[PDB]
Amino acid sequence: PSLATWTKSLRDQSLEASIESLIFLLKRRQVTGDECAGAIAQLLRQVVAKSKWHDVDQLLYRVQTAGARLARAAPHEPVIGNIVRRVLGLIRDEASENSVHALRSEVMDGIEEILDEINQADDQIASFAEIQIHPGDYVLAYQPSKTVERFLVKAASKRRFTVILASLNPPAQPYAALRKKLNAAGVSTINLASNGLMAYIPRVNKVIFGAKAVYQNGGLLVDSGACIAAQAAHEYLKPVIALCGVYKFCPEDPSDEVSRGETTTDYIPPDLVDVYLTNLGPQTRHHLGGIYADHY
């Protein structure tokens, strides 16, 4: 139903059972994309811990078979692939540095550092909120991700401003906990029950949303309907800010099909995005390319 129990119990179950459970969770899709990255890292770490391997290439085979299965599980989230290849890169680096046990525990603790990097990514990003948001600002937060919500909260701790909450579809009320967790901080919130944001855009000062993925060209994978906000914002020259962790930075260009069409998720071309905010800092497209070199 949820899986704090699974993370605690991940060690207890046979590796395969855990993998199947992870796949089921992915199919359900309940797990947060941000959370999704953490699960992949952890699952692969315990793969390394409990898999049958006796040389380095074996590691590469076992984490790629696992990672591939995990990739078929949730095609919608490409962060999985990134996490997998990052783990692989680490193993390769260890091999280059180069006996199974020492390698085992450096790979495992490397994965642990990936894990906690992922977990403090949100607050590290939120540290820039005070700079990006000014007093009296009007912020259109579209389908706010947990990254975005905590961004807005610590923006709220040191600034007084207004948040405009836009969602693609009506509830089958949204963001209640978030919106007066915001009013408590003294931030005004108005929740838009409109699909199509062209009417309200001139009144907001900037647009903020989380990204599920970032491609080489600067393209984004976002929630559906985020692109209408992005485009509407772009025509009125309102700054578009994407909140994304470095692990979500893809070394792949988008598929042509993805570029051509999305829905579940939508694609935003790089010309519609003015700022990428990451844990390492705010990065330009050129700088994005730069950290891609850093990341992989």
Binding site: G196, A199, C227, T263
Partner: protein, 312 residues
Amino acid sequence: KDARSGIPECFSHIPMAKRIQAHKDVHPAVLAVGQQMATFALKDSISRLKATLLAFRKVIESYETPKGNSLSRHFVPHVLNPQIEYLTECRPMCFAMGNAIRLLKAKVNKFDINTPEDEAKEGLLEWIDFLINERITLAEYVIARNAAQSINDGDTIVTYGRHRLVEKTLLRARKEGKSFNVTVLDDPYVGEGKELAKVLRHAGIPVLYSPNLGGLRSKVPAASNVFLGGEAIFANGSLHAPSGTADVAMAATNAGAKVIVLCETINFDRERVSVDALTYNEIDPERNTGDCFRLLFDNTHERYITGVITEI
């Protein structure tokens, strides 16, 4: 309580439909029509206009001038105006209603005391009939005609929500033997576009339906032609339309797709100019509150409109 209260300050100036028994004497027709306006049974400006005109028509023929008075002095102040204001407090009047009313009162004050009652009343009546026939019915027929002739075989037509003129156009074009594809986009908060889709598929028109405006760039290609209807067109050339319209129009414009608006001349407002959606708008009666807020219409700049098709 005050429905007006709780509206965010930015949108305070904006009018809202007040649900309303507890009314001044009014003609039964006007009462009915106004209350179908309150329920939002009629939200097309043309349907509202036509209903209002028929109601006012029966109001005119039931009217008998008091003895020792003139019709011209008596009718506008004591009879027509109560109907008008009742209607205004059932729901804020659309431009069509305002314009038609202004014209009607122009004809009432053309009248004089020496004008007998009998010819004045049916002067008003076939003025109403001429207005309905040539500014509404014939106008619709002609717009449908012209727009259907604009369509060519193999075209992909994109429309937003369900608009009476766009529907009549696509249907007419289909019965002319033309073959084309229609993409119907919808407001998930309204959802009439779906039944539009069902109608178009009943006639043999292939339809792709999207319940919302997500993935918009995908389904508004440069090759596509976008047909839109509205409630009115302002003097500066911008289109007053159901919310979400401007998004489709801009998306299409930046795709390179043609954006064609269909509109009757009765809906052109020469007198007023709007530069933003906030100047002339209406709040959703149920979503007045700050926790859940929605505006009924949006403004589409002339910038995003390729052409307008009218009877004229």
